[PDB]
Design a protein around this ligand. Sequence first.
Ligand SMILES: CC(C)(C)c1ccc(-c2nc3c(NC(=O)[C@H](O)CO)cccc3c(=O)[nH]2)cc1
Lengths: 195, 198
Amino acid sequence: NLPEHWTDMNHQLFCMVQLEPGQSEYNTIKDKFTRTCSSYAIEKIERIQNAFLWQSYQVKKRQMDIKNDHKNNERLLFHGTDADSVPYVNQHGFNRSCAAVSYGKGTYFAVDASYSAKDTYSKPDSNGRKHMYVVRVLTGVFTKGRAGLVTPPPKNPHNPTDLFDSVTNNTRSPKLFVVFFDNQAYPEYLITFTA
Amino acid sequence: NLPEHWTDMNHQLFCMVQLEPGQSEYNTIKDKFTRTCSSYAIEKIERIQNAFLWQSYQVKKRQMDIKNDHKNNERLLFHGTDADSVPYVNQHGFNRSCAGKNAVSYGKGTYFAVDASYSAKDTYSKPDSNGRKHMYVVRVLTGVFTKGRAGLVTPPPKNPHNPTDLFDSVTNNTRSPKLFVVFFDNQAYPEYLITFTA
Ligand SMILES: CC(C)(C)c1ccc(-c2nc3c(NC(=O)[C@H](O)CO)cccc3c(=O)[nH]2)cc1
C-alpha cells in the first residue's frame, strides 16, 4: 500500500517528514522548484505521508488507468496557497469548494513553480514565508477549459457522461490544469520558501 | 471487492438491474418507501451496480470505520432528483457542485432525507414529461454529525482549536435527524433508483 520511500510512522496514518538537505529526494524536489524559481530561498521541504489520501488517490489512479486504457494519466504539478490553508491540505487534500476560476470551478495546478509562486497564490504570511505543494495530479485526457464549468466537458456530446479527466488553458502547451473531483490530486511535498 | 450478489457484468463497469417484486431485496425498499409515501405507486426499482463508485465509496467507509470508534457510520437515505440528472448520478454519483439550495439550508452540500416523503416532493423528484418521479436510495457515510448551518462548505470542526478534525456530516437536528448533508465526493453510494408515479 504505502510507498517505499516513506519512512516509518509508528503505526500512525499521517506524518509530515522534513527532508534532509543534500540527499537524493530533497535534491530531486528542489531541482523541480529551482528550474523556474531559482531566485527564491528554500527554508525546508517536507514529505506529506497521508495514508488515507494516498489510498483514495491510488484507487482513482487505478480506475483512470483502466478507463483510458493507458497509464500516462499522472503529472507532477505545483499548487501555491496561503498559510491558513496548509493544515487542511495536508490532512484533507484539495477541495474545489474552498476556491479565480476562469477555466472552471475546480482546483488549479501549475506546470511551472514560478506560476504558483505568485503572491496571489502562495500568499506570504506574517513572516514572509510562502508555501507551495508539489502534487501528483491525475490529469488524464484533457481539453480546454472555460469559465463556469463544474465538471470537465464530455468527450462526445453523444455520451454526455463520458468526461474528460481535467481541463487546461491550452491543450498544445498547457501551463495550468484544473481537476474537479476530490482525490484526483495527492499533495506529496510542501515547500516553504521566501522571495 | 464487488458484492457477490451482483449480476455478472461481463467485464463492464456499470449496469442497472431491474428487481422483481416478491424478492426480499425489492420488498424491503418498497416497504421503506411506502412507510411515508403510501399515496404514490412504484413503477420499478433498479439496483445500481457501479464498480468504480462502489470501490471509492467502500474505501471511504473503511477509513471512517477506522477513524471513528466502533460507530455505525452508514445510513440508508433517500435522494429525489430530476430526470436530467439521473444519467450523471448513475455514473458519477452525487456532486455537491451541482446541488440545489435546500429550502432549509444546513450547508452547501448534497442533501439526503431520512423519509422518502421528503424526497418525494416535486421540488426534488421533479416529474418528467411522462409524469415519472425519480428517487435514489443511498448508502451515506453520515459518521459523527452535528447540527449544520447555512454557511458551511465543509463539515465544521469538532473542536474550534483543531480546525482540521471534522465532523463527518451535518444534520437539521441531532436529536431527531430528518436530513443529512455531505460535503465530499464518494461519501454516498447511489444503490437503488426508484421510478414512481402518482
Ligand atoms: C484561495 C486562495 C488562497 C486565494 C488561492 C487562490 C489561488 C490559488 C492558485 N491558483 C492557481 C491558478 N489559478 C488561475 O489560473 C486562476 O485563478 C483561474 O482563473 C493557476 C495555476 C496554479 C495556481 C495555484 O497554484 N494556486 C491558490 C490559493
